[PDB]
Amino acid sequence: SSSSYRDSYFQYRHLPAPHHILYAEWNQDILALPDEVANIMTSEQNSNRYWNSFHDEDDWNLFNGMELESNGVVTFA
Amino acid sequence: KYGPLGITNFITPYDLCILILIHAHCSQDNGISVPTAVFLRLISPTRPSLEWNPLLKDNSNLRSSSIVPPPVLPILDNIIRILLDDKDGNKIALTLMGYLEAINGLDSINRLMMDLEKNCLVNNYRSMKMRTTSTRRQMTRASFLGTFLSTCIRKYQIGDFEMRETIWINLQNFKTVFKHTPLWLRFKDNVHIQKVKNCLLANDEISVEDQQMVEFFQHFNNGNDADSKTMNEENYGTLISIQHLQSIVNRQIVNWLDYEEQSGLVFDLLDTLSLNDATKFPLIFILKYLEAIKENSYQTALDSLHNYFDYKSTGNSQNYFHISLL
Amino acid sequence: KLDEFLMLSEQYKSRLPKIRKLGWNRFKPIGINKTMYELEMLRSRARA
Amino acid sequence: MGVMYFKKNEFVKAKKYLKKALEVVKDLDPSSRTTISIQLNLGHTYRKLNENEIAIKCFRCVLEKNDKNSEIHCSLGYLYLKTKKLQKAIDHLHKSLYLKPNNSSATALLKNALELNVTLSLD
Amino acid sequence: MIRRAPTTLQLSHDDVTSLIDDLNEQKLKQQLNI
Amino acid sequence: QDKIIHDIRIQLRKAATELSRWKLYGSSKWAAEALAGLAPQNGFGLSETEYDLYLLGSTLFDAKEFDRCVFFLKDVTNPYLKFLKLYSKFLSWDKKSQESMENILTTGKFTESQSNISSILKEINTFLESYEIKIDDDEADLGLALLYYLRGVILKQEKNISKAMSSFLKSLSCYSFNWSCWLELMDCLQKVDDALLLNNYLYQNFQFKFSENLGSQRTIEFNIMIKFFKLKVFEELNGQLEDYFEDLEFLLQVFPNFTFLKAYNATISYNNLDYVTAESRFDDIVKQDPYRLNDLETYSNILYVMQKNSKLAYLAQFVSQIDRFRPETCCIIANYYSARQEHEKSIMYFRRALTLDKKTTNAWTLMGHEFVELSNSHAAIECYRRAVDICPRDFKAWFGLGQAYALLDMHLYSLYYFQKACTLKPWDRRI
Amino acid sequence: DSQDKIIHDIRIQLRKAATELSRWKLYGSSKWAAEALAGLAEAIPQNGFGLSETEYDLYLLGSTLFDAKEFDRCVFFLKDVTNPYLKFLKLYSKFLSWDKKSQESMENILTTGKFTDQSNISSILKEINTFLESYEIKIDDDEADLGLALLYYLRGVILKQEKNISKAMSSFLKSLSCYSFNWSCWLELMDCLQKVDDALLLNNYLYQNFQFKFSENLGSQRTIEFNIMIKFFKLKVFEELNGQLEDYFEDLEFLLQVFPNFTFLKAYNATISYNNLDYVTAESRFDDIVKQDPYRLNDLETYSNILYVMQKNSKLAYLAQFVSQIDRFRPETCCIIANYYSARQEHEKSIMYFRRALTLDKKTTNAWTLMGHEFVELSNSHAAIECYRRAVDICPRDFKAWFGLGQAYALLDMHLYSLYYFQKACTLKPWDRRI
């Protein structure tokens, strides 16, 4: 027949060690994403605080109990 | 008989030799019953687990009430010398010799193993009495040989084709070592070998065409040395299980502490570990330690002791840190 | 001391049916919206 | 605008405005949910208008632009079942079901194509 | 400023059911002629 | 013969070196191996400031560091060095391009997607459109054919078969004596009547670029491998053969002791179910080239029918001794376990072989058969599907689906599946 | 003036250097050669081989069957050849066939070596000696081709794997003398070195009684003072072993001028700052590498090592996502991610990646100590102790391994049972306050 003669796709000789096929599962590993999954509702709060750290004192004081309504009218605490 | 040593969790070539012997005994076609003392010297070292604390306990259970022969090294030269002693042991010895000649292929190995599980080994005694139509002796699982053969059966179905090839490449290496030995010259021709070999070689189903090229597969792989050999990874000269190594080491240290043994062969073989089996077998370190004290070497004693107590503590779940200091 | 041979013996014993027990559950052919896990449960009720 | 005028079942001003939109955007937006969206919408309007020929052509060009899409395959199969080209539609239904698990409407369509294949006795 | 996906509609259930009913019609009438 | 064979040697020597030079392992392997069976011309369009990148790109590719090579050739205006970057870029995507459902079977782990190639396809169109000399006339050279060939294969990825043939035939007109290009052309057929139509295109519409090629090679019928083309097509699917026997004889006279021809020639017997002759025709090639491993699985398959397990086992022992991770090596081993009725374990080795190429010969189908003996009836059916999409020309793949659906209560889906396979192999009495 | 003339000389040679080595299908030096030319400062193809057209056909068969991983098949067809150029290929195919096979045979065995610290291998060695005697130059001649020089390299490396040290260097010096500009040749000569005093032993030999074959090498290059890998020699060995530096400075800035764009040099230069516990400066050095060369899984293990000390888990999560996207089979990419997982206190996952990283390349002993640390935070002291223990079996002169093992006992009430381990570590780095 004719199997190894075609070179139109990733074959056994393109990767360096042909014996790497033994593992062949590390590709199917979802590496954990940066920030919130380190907490594993608390993750978003932790992430919120982590980004919330970047304020000036008065600026943070403005947004302590900040709430914005849909129509655009503003409530300040 | 020397060579590199490596621990194997698979069927060692030594293991098949017992399987060779048990096949002849159970077949009862040749009327050859291997003496019980032979089995008890061969299988018993393979029986698992003895344990031996470094110090703080001396031969509290290791000493056998009856003096036992030393365990046998996995070389055809040593194995044959056990059967050879008897006046009729030649007949038993040739039985082993012929079977090793008949087994020329991996398939033939499988024929032996399929034969035993289907016919010889049987789950329990209650089916002994219903199987009076069997022309071969049948084995119970709980028996001395039965429990061993069960383990051997397990170690064959446990691996892929990768392990089976290693069995045959090593056995042919193992068989050929005995070939360039003076004793093999003494047994160059024995006519009985051909008789026993032809007993099992029969029913080959082909003798004219395949056998012409069956030899070609065998010979081409083998080191005919006519051309450059096919290049293959370095293979170990001897394969032993962990439990078999436990028996030979324990006997050696006990013999050292206070039927002939082969100190040189055991010591030389123990010096070729891949350093990973040493982790799997921490007792190799202390074997140097007992040797170290004999010549009164201070630092060489110490590191070995520290070596032994680092691998042992991790392997065993119970806390032995309180034992290391003592 | 964990015997390495017994450990790998159980590991082989666990994986061997795993190939056989593959087609269970999630896998569904097309044209049959109902996986084979309940093909035998209905088959069990058929005779029983 | 075209999607709306399709909703109101006008089927005419929708087509005109959609054609105007694509003729505006012939040069740019080769991909990225713009050309595919407008072209598939125009093809669906042509299907609703029973003009199936340029419908087949535009659905084919959309499919060759992007293959992984259950809707494109299901609609092309619907177009083929409108005519008598079952041999070239049941494969598309096969692929559509392969891509997306349920496709209940596609399941019914393929089943009907099955009874057709039983019914027909072509050499 | 970001754009969302433009509205696109696929084959509904009513039209495909109309086609299935019709297609049963012409898989049903012709064997009477046969 | 006379100078005809001599003219082949010089030009075939070319097809061995430049193909190897610009990292086409598969094509160069066939061509160079043809030198041995057959009984330093150097040249490339490069500048000193640009020749350096080719060395940089080639050796990074050799070290299998695919992805770095793409960055280091980010801006190259060379007509055909650009091919090397895109080739690296394509493969970098491919290795991670595993469909989810097939992957579950591919591994059993049981746990940006495709837009890269769309950019790749747009890049190649943009480059050629802006390139100085198009494919028309006696212009273009060897490197241009590679671009179209790379363009052709990527077109096949989105199942654009109709345009795929145009690109491939275009590429080969510019440069011939590339084996790998014709291999992908085979998968473009998936039908019987088109083959003669394609044959008609070659005989009348097709023309060669004599500028690059040597004498007596622009003509189609003096070409030697257009026979190879005809050999491969009439063995994948018989159909109606045209000059098949007559042309086969001529190519046998040339290329003495050529292993590939003998394997193909012997393979014909297997397609004809003449097992006794097939073994003899396989047996000699083993003696001649013991270290050749291609298409030994066919030798295993026939031995499976004959059930010469003793013979088969030594074959399995012999094959595994010299290599243990080539796709045929695992394939033959998995076949061996089937002979031992150990169907549950043959899956594992077939699984190992599958991950090696993931587009092999009919190994997907053999994987499915073992599931049938396990009565899974659901892994096997979707398994049989994977053979279909890859190679829709496989008789066994289609047959397995109909056979499996026969066991299923519904028989309605089975009729269509059998109908396709009926067209593929109408000669079979069973179907 | 003279420097520019040197630059023009360097370009010609590295073009030749990467040509034959890649043409002879060895990538240890071929990959080095091009990148070295790539980083060269801005200021017709060259090829030649004494092969007959009949035998040259065999070359193509041998060459393409090599990289198709069918090494054994290459040997069979190339058996009867007599040319020294192709003779090297046949044995090299035989050698690599063994090397690949040995890797296949052993994957579950983690540690490598022999406790006390062939016949198949000896078959290759005899063929080398048999062919070398038959051939009618046998080195020590002005008319010595590259193929013979390359042939000695195979002889040197095959001898060392048999542990026949003190003979391999002699072969390697002969190979380097007849043909310099073989980076793969220099490494295998690096690994054989063990101590700084031997570095001085050989360094002199390269100076007084060493000279290159000026016939093979181009002019203005055979001079030892204006050579390059003699300079590249100084940079690598004196610092990887951390030996006493001599003739080291003036060579260093000399290489910066000639190779301003060389990625390998900068990472090594960055490595030097890392090795001196100078982390701020090194971070700046590596940051150029990432921007200039985004795809280099060669020295970024140190980068992630730095970033772990740095903190900024956010920056570390940048690398782990980016590095893993390239490929998951390099030794480094499996240690890059392990650090990121460790920083987030998932040890039971991060512990696994470290073992994965070691499995790919067993020479990266640095992962062993990191392996043990994650055990400690899992409160499994037993599992930890053997871990550090393997690290010091592979090489006794490991300060980190001894210290990590001493601590694990120290966490337990075995204050004295730990005195030995700490005492051993004292010899390695006496000049530390922490110990």
CA pair distance C28, D2, nearest whole angstrom: 39
Closest CA to G403 of G380, G426, G376: G426
Kindly report the nearest CA distance between residue D70 and chain C, in angstroms: 14
CB of F283 within 8 Å of a chain B CB? The answer is yes
Crossing angle of the two packed helices G300-310 and G279-292, in degrees rounded to 10:
130
- Is the Cβ–Cβ distance between G265 and G259 less than 8 Å? yes
Which residues make Cβ contacts (< 8 Å) with residue F6, sequence separation at least 6?
none
DSSP class of residue G24? T
SS3 for chain C is CCCHHHHHHHHHHHHHHHHHCCCCCCCCCCCCCCCCHHHHHHHHHHHC
Tell which F residues from 295 to 354 touch G, by Cβ distance under 8 Å.
322-326
CA pair distance F210, F219, nearest whole angstrom: 9
Residue of chain G whose alpha carbon sits nearest to that of A27? G328
Hey, what amino acid is at B249? Answer: V
DSSP B216-258: HHHHHHTT--SSPPPP-----SEEE-HHHHHHHHHHHHHHHH-
CA pair distance F148, F136, nearest whole angstrom: 13
CB of D88 within 8 Å of a chain F CB? The answer is no
- Is the Cβ–Cβ distance between F290 and F259 less than 8 Å? no
Give the angle G132-G135-G137 at the CA atoms, nearest 5°: 95
Task: Give φ, ψ of G61 to 5 degrees.
Answer: -60, -45
Using CB atoms, pick whichever of B154, B280, B316 lies closest to residue C4.
Answer: B280
CA F58 to chain CA centroid, Å, is 24
Neighbours of F162 (CB within 10 A): 11
Which helix H or strand E contains A73, and what residues bound it?
none
Helix-, strand-, coil-residue percentages of chain G, each rounded to 5? 65, 0, 35
- Say what the alpha-carbon torsion angle B94, B99, B104, B107 is, to the nearest 10 degrees: 180
CB of F290 within 8 Å of a chain B CB? The answer is yes
First to last CA, chain D: 48
The pair of three-digit structure tokens given for residue F155, joined into one six-digit string:
């077109």
Q: What is the experimental method?
A: cryo-EM
- Is the Cβ–Cβ distance between F253 and F5 less than 8 Å? no
Using CB atoms, pick whichever of G71, G114, G382 lies closest to residue B275.
Answer: G114
CA pair distance G390, G375, nearest whole angstrom: 14
CB of F107 within 8 Å of a chain A CB? The answer is yes
**Secondary structure of residue D85 in the 3-state scheme:** coil
CB of B127 within 8 Å of a chain C CB? The answer is no
Residue of chain D whose alpha carbon sits nearest to that of C29? D98
DSSP class of residue G306? H
Residues of C in contact with D107 (CB under 8 A): 31, 33
Residues of D in contact with E31 (CB under 8 A): 119
Kindly report the nearest CA distance between residue F313 and chain B, in angstroms: 6
CA pair distance G425, G435, nearest whole angstrom: 8
Residue F107 and residue A28: Cβ atoms within 8 Å? yes
Tell which D residues from 46 to 75 touch C, by Cβ distance under 8 Å.
none
Neighbours of B71 (CB within 10 A): 22
**Secondary structure of residue B72 in the 3-state scheme:** coil
Residue B315 and residue C3: Cβ atoms within 8 Å? no
Give the angle D51-D56-D57 at the CA atoms, nearest 5°: 110
* Annotated resolution, angstroms: 5.4
Which residues make Cβ contacts (< 8 Å) with residue G317, sequence separation at least 6?
A33, A34, A35, G340
Residue A15 and residue G100: Cβ atoms within 8 Å? no
CA pair distance F295, F315, nearest whole angstrom: 13
Residues of F in contact with B169 (CB under 8 A): 321
Residue F398 lies in a domain: no
- Is residue G175 exposed (0-12), middle (13-18) or buried (19+ Cβ within 10 Å)? buried
Determine the length of chain G.
Answer: 435
CA pair distance A60, A53, nearest whole angstrom: 9
Task: Give φ, ψ of F13 to 5 degrees.
Answer: -60, -40
Residue F387 lies in a domain: no
Residues of D in contact with E23 (CB under 8 A): 81, 112, 116
CB of F292 within 8 Å of a chain G CB? The answer is yes
Residue of chain A whose alpha carbon sits nearest to that of F104? A28
Residue C8 and residue B155: Cβ atoms within 8 Å? no
CB of G296 within 8 Å of a chain F CB? The answer is yes
Residues of C in contact with B241 (CB under 8 A): 5
List helix spans (H) across G207-296.
229-240, 249-258, 263-275, 279-292
Neighbours of B56 (CB within 10 A): 7
Give the angle G83-G84-G90 at the CA atoms, nearest 5°: 90
Buried residues in G292-323 as b, exposed as e (16+ CB within 10 A): ebebbbebbbbbbbbbbeeeebeebbebbeeb
Place of tokens 């082993």: B96
CB of E4 within 8 Å of a chain D CB? The answer is no
Kindly report the nearest CA distance between residue G393 and chain F, in angstroms: 31
Kindly report the nearest CA distance between residue C1 and chain B, in angstroms: 5
Interface with G, mutate which of A2, A26, A29, A30 (most G CBs under 10 A): A26
Which helix H or strand E contains G1, and what residues bound it?
none
CB of F315 within 8 Å of a chain B CB? The answer is yes
DSSP class of residue A35? S
Residue F25 and residue G27: Cβ atoms within 8 Å? no
- Is residue F297 exposed (0-12), middle (13-18) or buried (19+ Cβ within 10 Å)? buried
The pair of three-digit structure tokens given for residue F384, joined into one six-digit string:
């049989």
The pair of three-digit structure tokens given for residue F86, joined into one six-digit string:
């895109």
CA pair distance F380, F386, nearest whole angstrom: 10
DSSP class of residue A27? G
SS3 for chain F is CCHHHHHHHHHHHHHHHHHHHCCCHHHHHHHHHHHHHCCCCCCCCCCHHHHHHHHHHHHHHHCCCHHHHHHHCCCCCCCCHHHHHHHHHHHHHHHCCCCHHHHHHHHCCCCCCCHHHHHHHHHHHHHHHHCCCCCCCCCCCHHHHHHHHHHHHHHHHCCCHHHHHHHHHHHHHHCCCCHHHHHHHHCCCCCCHHHHHHHHHHHHHCCCCCCCCCCCCCCCCCCCHHHHHHHHHHHHCCCCCCCHHHHHHHHHHCCCCCHHHHHHHHHHHHHCCCHHHHHHHHHHHHHHCCCCCCCHHHHHHHHHHHCCHHHHHHHHHHHHHHCCCCHHHHHHHHHHHHHCCCHHHHHHHHHHHHHHHCCCCCHHHHHHHHHHHCCCCCHHHHHHHHHHHHCCCCHHHHHHHHHHHHHCCCCHHHHHHHHHHHHHCCCCCCC
- Is the Cβ–Cβ distance between F250 and F34 less than 8 Å? no
Give me the CATH number covering residue F255.
1.25.40.10
Give whole-number Cα distances, F73 to F66, F77, G342, in Å: 12, 10, 36
- Say what the alpha-carbon torsion angle F13, F14, F16, F20 is, to the nearest 10 degrees: 150
Give whole-number Cα distances, B305 to B272, B273, C6, F214, in Å: 20, 18, 28, 78
Place of tokens 């003899």: F280
Place of tokens 């010091």: G392
Using CB atoms, pick whichever of D33, D71, D81 lies closest to residue E10.
Answer: D71
Residue of chain B whose alpha carbon sits nearest to that of F276? B209
CA pair distance B35, G202, nearest whole angstrom: 66
Residue F423 lies in a domain: no
Which residues make Cβ contacts (< 8 Å) with residue D113, sequence separation at least 6?
D77, D81, D86, D89, D90, D93
| Domain total in chain F | 1
The pair of three-digit structure tokens given for residue G122, joined into one six-digit string:
């000896």
Q: Do chains E and B touch (3 or more CB pairs under 8 A)?
A: no
Give the angle B176-B180-B185 at the CA atoms, nearest 5°: 115
Residues of C in contact with B158 (CB under 8 A): 8-9, 12
- Is the Cβ–Cβ distance between G68 and A4 less than 8 Å? yes
Residue F408 lies in a domain: no
- Is the Cβ–Cβ distance between B160 and F340 less than 8 Å? no
CATH architecture of the domain covering G1-367: Alpha Horseshoe (1.25)
Residue B6 bridge partners (DSSP):
B239
Residue of chain G whose alpha carbon sits nearest to that of B278? G115
- Is the Cβ–Cβ distance between F146 and F22 less than 8 Å? yes
Residue F317 and residue B105: Cβ atoms within 8 Å? yes
CA pair distance B204, F162, nearest whole angstrom: 55
Which residues make Cβ contacts (< 8 Å) with residue F69, sequence separation at least 6?
F56, F57, F60, F61, F84, F85, F88
Residue F59 and residue G30: Cβ atoms within 8 Å? yes
Hey, what amino acid is at B266? Answer: V
**Secondary structure of residue G105 in the 3-state scheme:** helix
CA pair distance F224, F216, nearest whole angstrom: 10
CB of C10 within 8 Å of a chain B CB? The answer is no
CA pair distance G120, F146, nearest whole angstrom: 43
Residues of C in contact with F347 (CB under 8 A): 19
Which helix H or strand E contains B117, and what residues bound it?
none
Task: Give φ, ψ of F90 to 5 degrees.
Answer: -65, -50
Residue F37 lies in a domain: yes
CA G63 to chain CA centroid, Å, is 25
Using CB atoms, pick whichever of C1, C3, C9 lies closest to residue B158.
Answer: C9
Place of tokens 């010089």: F10
The pair of three-digit structure tokens given for residue F293, joined into one six-digit string:
């491993």
Residues of D in contact with C27 (CB under 8 A): none
Q: Do chains C and F touch (3 or more CB pairs under 8 A)?
A: yes
- Is the Cβ–Cβ distance between F150 and F86 less than 8 Å? yes
Interface with C, mutate which of B150, B157, B312 (most C CBs under 10 A): B157
Kindly report the nearest CA distance between residue B10 and chain C, in angstroms: 9
Using CB atoms, pick whichever of D3, D74, D119 lies closest to residue E11.
Answer: D74
- Is the Cβ–Cβ distance between C35 and D114 less than 8 Å? no
- Is the Cβ–Cβ distance between B222 and G90 less than 8 Å? no
Residue A15 and residue F352: Cβ atoms within 8 Å? no
Residue F230 lies in a domain: yes
Give me the total of CB pairs closer than 8 Å, taking one residue from chain B and one from chain F. Answer: 61
Residue of chain G whose alpha carbon sits nearest to that of A28? G328
CA pair distance G115, A39, nearest whole angstrom: 45
CA pair distance F161, F155, nearest whole angstrom: 7
Residues of C in contact with F377 (CB under 8 A): 23, 36
CB of E9 within 8 Å of a chain D CB? The answer is yes
Place of tokens 């075939």: F12
- Is the Cβ–Cβ distance between B266 and B248 less than 8 Å? yes
CA pair distance G47, F100, nearest whole angstrom: 48
- Greatest CA separation found in chain D? 48
List helix spans (H) across G106-195.
119-134, 146-161, 168-178, 183-192
- Is the Cβ–Cβ distance between D117 and E28 less than 8 Å? no
Residues of F in contact with D64 (CB under 8 A): 158, 160, 163
